[PDB]
From Swiss-Prot, chains C, D:
Coiled-coil stretches noted in the UniProt entry, renumbered to this chain: none
Residue numbers of the full-length protein present here: 579 to 849 of 2183
Domain of life per record: Viruses
Role, per record: Forms an icosahedral capsid of pseudo T=3 symmetry with capsid proteins VP2 and VP3. The capsid is 300 Angstroms in diameter, composed of 60 copies of each capsid protein and enclosing the viral positive strand RNA genome. Capsid protein VP1 mainly forms the vertices of the capsid. Capsid protein VP1 interacts with host CXADR to provide virion attachment to target host cells. This attachment induces virion internalization. Tyrosine kinases are probably involved in the entry process. After binding to its receptor, the capsid undergoes conformational changes.
Compartments where found: Virion; Host cytoplasm
Official protein name in the record: Capsid protein VP1
Quaternary structure (record): Interacts with capsid protein VP0, and capsid protein VP3 to form heterotrimeric protomers. Five protomers subsequently associate to form pentamers which serve as building blocks for the capsid. Interacts with capsid protein VP2, capsid protein VP3 and capsid protein VP4 following cleavage of capsid protein VP0. Interacts with host CXADR.
């Protein structure tokens, strides 16, 4: 069957028994930087299995009035294992990812999620004179949440699914690598993101390569007398992580 | 001199271009490159999905 | 060529083949043709996708700014004008480029320079044909503080001199980003702290255009307005994005106001 | 090509080789690469030194003077203007050439000629399009003393005639020093006594440009200003010098005022 | 006619020049000569100094 | 000349212009563990240049009445860079070292030091009923000091150079890899220690593979009117560091 899969990376392994294939974003599979595309002249450290391995993030509760969740990368893995340690000590990094979303339910539950990895998901702001602040772009391992309707603030992110937090049709986030999790079909999504940037390597705190957004397009619904807590778990492994520009820890 | 076909119909038909500058940024824009590869957006899946078969077996 | 697929003739079917049925839970989108859902005839199809190339789409000159300056300094325009180079002060050109995340291209800059007579208490005007300078100052160059200063000597700064009543002047510019492509959207900050400017304006640092009259002022007043036109050439674009839904607010931010997805309909069933 | 060196991969070392240690008491400067002081990867490097050639550095037109003349003689400009040819009245172009002691090059001279209306008690102006002459008089030629004199017959003197509303006129000039290169700095005197002019101005003797209106004066007044632009071409330069630190004082001397080496810092340790 | 490569990238690309004048001072500037010899400023020493060895033995 | 040397490891390099060769301890140069001597079945991470690179420790003041100093390894590098980070997250590690001691002086100063790396330098205790405590075995990047004469305490290390803190002749610490720094000859010592243990890998906090001891055998002496502060600096790089048994950070 096509519904059963395992992905083994490092000392971690994930199993699925319902899945709707694997999306390889832009048809490019993660790899180390070549000698003809390099520009950092020091030897790169490649920690291999010690950084490339699934890291489970904090789970979010799917409710009937939920409007979605987002996690920015690499800043959701900034405190995760030795992946986050090698971010501390290095000026440059460069990594692809396999992102795996889990959300099982019974056959008497219904709902549909869009799972999409958006490169360069620069976000708007409630006040038009101000930039959104870091605390509102990022929650780390915890997700930031979309809201159903428009919000107000000064440095708050403008959240409202219809605009997707970016001023674009939310229905058009399908030219970006994506899968859907529809509870009557599959219980997992898998996206494999290559490294995508216009520079061959970049700092891992000052820049977010992509944002994973999970947006309900068909609300959660079930008859009362069924399970009322349904989590969505995001477990994501780095792939081909390498770092250059070793110096003391920090980022300021 | 470079001699290349013009855009023409449907059911003479060449033009001549000579570059006059030492930079390739000075050159006229390339408008006759019609290569495509829609499959990296339209079919970006690890396993090849055959149309006639079930998506999910 | 850019020619599209032919329709293939197809007869009745009754098989366990199911081209119509699919799962959209895969990121894959269906590859169905009309030759899978009904009879169909063979159509030899000669239509081309020639003009839907990104090097034909983006390769038409678009106005990006205009800036005014005045001989008299009549209405607070100074004797020279300036513009920090960006592509984001105009809605139309900006939207086309923001359907992509990274673009590398060469530009072609055309200038349409016009002048007009101003109200004055001066009597008797017989002002010579104006000459104008357009000076490009790369980042970290000295800048004009007056129309007469040493910076207009243009010893290394690229410059155009052009006289009215002649064809619009143009110059090519090559690809010139620090990166390997221009960045339309940057989800980072300019500080490692994660403070300062946020967005694509962090990576914007493309110099400044200055423009003056070269002629000394005459007893009346003339205001000249220069309109700057950029045309992408030799383009490669990467990472498609949605077209904008919302109107822009600012030329350095994406901040947006919440707007409707689509326009109204009376009901689900309309004719 | 002008392509730069590749980085070479290098492993751990422990040897009596000492690339890092050197003596700077030799005039020789170290040839160390990153591949001598740390690990390093192989980087195939495609960067070029193409635009840092001396024939790209010096080969952009720079204004060297402007001089004014007036039909009316309104504000003491005479009916013709003159300029003794030199490259030292402008800071920017001068500094670039003074990074070398000897330069042989051809020049290209472009003129940007503009006119403007002047205040007058004249009424009704409908002045025809001006024509202008630019005459080069080699050393020891007869010189204008008026706008009408016999010297403007240009029987052997090179000359340009140009009408306003047209493209800037230009002419090439070949290498034309008495020596085998132009001399930017001369540590000698013009006399064997060791008196007279000292410095590079001893060897300066490059003729004089004269410029007039060719049209007879009209009842108002027009002042025309001509800006002269030199561009080196086909350059060979010899004996590199430091760039200038001090601002210039004079166009015939190097005299200078004592100035700071660099700008301030608070302390030895700054961030 | 002289046919010579243009400046172009990185990972058609020729131009044609004909000289129209009887002087070589009239010609366009040579911008594509990229020859170098830094060693007469950077290493102007009588005895060749090998990098790995002591400067002064 | 034989007096000039460089050692390049990672993005660090040391230069000497007076040295008395390099001692390769037991004639064995650091290497990764082979497949025929392995017993940990998970893939080893080998961080290469990111962990193998000189780390300068805190300097000690050589005085005329100094009796010596010691630093235990790997516990002097436990907070050093990503070498110390990979100690945190891994059950096992395994590394060789190059240890480089620096101590220059004028030609009007005299003194002699023994620089010796002692495998398994288990130490005695002042009280004969008690074991020495961790705070007295180890100072981390800071050295613990030998004393000229016998000390007392309850959990204090018995320090007295004559016994070398181990109950053996101090003059017999010359069958262990060693060099001397004699101020009229050389200003540096270099020892290259292989990994030496009776197990192929071991935990890096619970065990100290060797101890570097620096012991004056000829006191510092100089005529008053000369420099009176002379440091001894120990700069030590890991070599062929690899780790197995990835889990959460800590050591308890």
């Amino acid at each position: 069957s096509d519904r059963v899969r395992s992905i083994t990376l490092g000392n971690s392994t994930i199993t699925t028994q319902e899945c709707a294939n694997v999306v390889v974003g832009y048809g490019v599979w993660p790899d180390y930087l070549s000698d003809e595309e390099a520009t950092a002249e020091d030897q790169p450290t490649q920690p291999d299995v010690a950084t490339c391995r699934f890291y489970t993030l904090n789970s979010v509760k799917w409710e009937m009035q939920s409007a979605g969740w987002w996690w920015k990368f690499p800043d959701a893995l900034s405190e995760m294992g030795l992946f986050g340690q090698n971010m501390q000590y290095h000026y440059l990094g460069r990594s692809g990812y396999t992102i795996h979303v889990q959300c099982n339910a019974s056959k008497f539950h219904q709902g549909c999620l869009l799972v999409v990895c958006v490169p360069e998901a620069e976000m708007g702001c409630t006040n038009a004179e101000n930039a959104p602040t870091y605390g509102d772009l990022c929650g780390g391992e915890t997700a930031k949440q979309f809201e159903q309707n428009a919000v107000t603030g000064e440095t708050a992110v403008q959240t409202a699914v219809c605009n997707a937090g970016m001023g674009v049709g939310v229905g058009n986030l399908t030219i970006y690598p994506h899968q859907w999790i529809n509870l009557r079909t599959n219980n997992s999504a898998t996206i494999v993101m290559p490294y995508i940037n216009s520079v061959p390597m970049d700092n891992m705190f000052r820049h977010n390569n992509f944002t994973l957004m999970i947006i309900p397009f068909a609300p959660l619904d079930y008859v009362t007398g069924a399970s009322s807590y349904i989590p969505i778990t995001v477990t994501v492994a780095p792939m081909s992580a390498e770092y250059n520009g070793l110096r003391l820890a920090g980022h300021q | 001199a470079q001699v290349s076909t013009q855009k023409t119909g449907a059911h003479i038909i060449h033009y001549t271009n000579i570059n006059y500058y030492k930079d390739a940024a000075s050159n006229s824009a390339n408008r006759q490159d019609f290569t495509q590869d829609p499959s990296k957006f339209t079919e970006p899946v690890k396993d090849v999905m055959i149309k006639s078969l079930p998506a999910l077996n | 060529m850019g020619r599209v697929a032919d329709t293939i003739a197809r007869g009745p079917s009754n098989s366990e083949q199911i081209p119509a049925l699919t799962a959209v839970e895969t990121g894959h989108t269906s590859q169905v043709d009309p030759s899978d859902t009904m009879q169909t005839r063979h159509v030899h199809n000669y239509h081309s996708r020639s003009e839907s190339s990104i090097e034909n789409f983006l390769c038409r000159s678009a106005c990006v700014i205009y800036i005014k300056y005045s001989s008299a300094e009549s209405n607070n325009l100074k004797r020279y004008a300036e513009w920090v180079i960006n592509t984001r002060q105009v809605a139309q050109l900006r939207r086309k480029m923001e359907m992509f995340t990274y673009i590398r291209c060469d530009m072609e800059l055309t200038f349409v320079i016009t002048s007009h007579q101003e109200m004055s208490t001066a009597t008797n005007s017989d002002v010579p044909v104006q000459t104008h300078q357009i000076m490009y100052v790369p980042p970290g160059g000295p800048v004009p503080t007056s129309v007469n200063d040493y910076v207009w000597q243009t010893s290394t700064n690229p410059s155009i001199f052009w006289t009215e009543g002649n064809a619009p002047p143009r110059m090519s510019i090559p690809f010139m980003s620090i990166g390997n492509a221009y960045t339309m959207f940057y989800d980072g900050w300019s500080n490692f702290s994660r403070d300062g400017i946020y967005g694509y304006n962090s990576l914007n640092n493309m110099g400044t255009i200055y423009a003056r009259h070269v002629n000394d002022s005459s007893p009346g007043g003339l205001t000249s307005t220069i309109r700057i036109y950029f045309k992408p050439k030799h383009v490669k674009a990467y990472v498609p994005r949605p077209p904008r839904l919302c109107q822009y607010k600012k030329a350095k931010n994406v901040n947006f106001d919440v707007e409707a997805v689509t326009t109204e309909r009376a009901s689900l069933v309309t004719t």
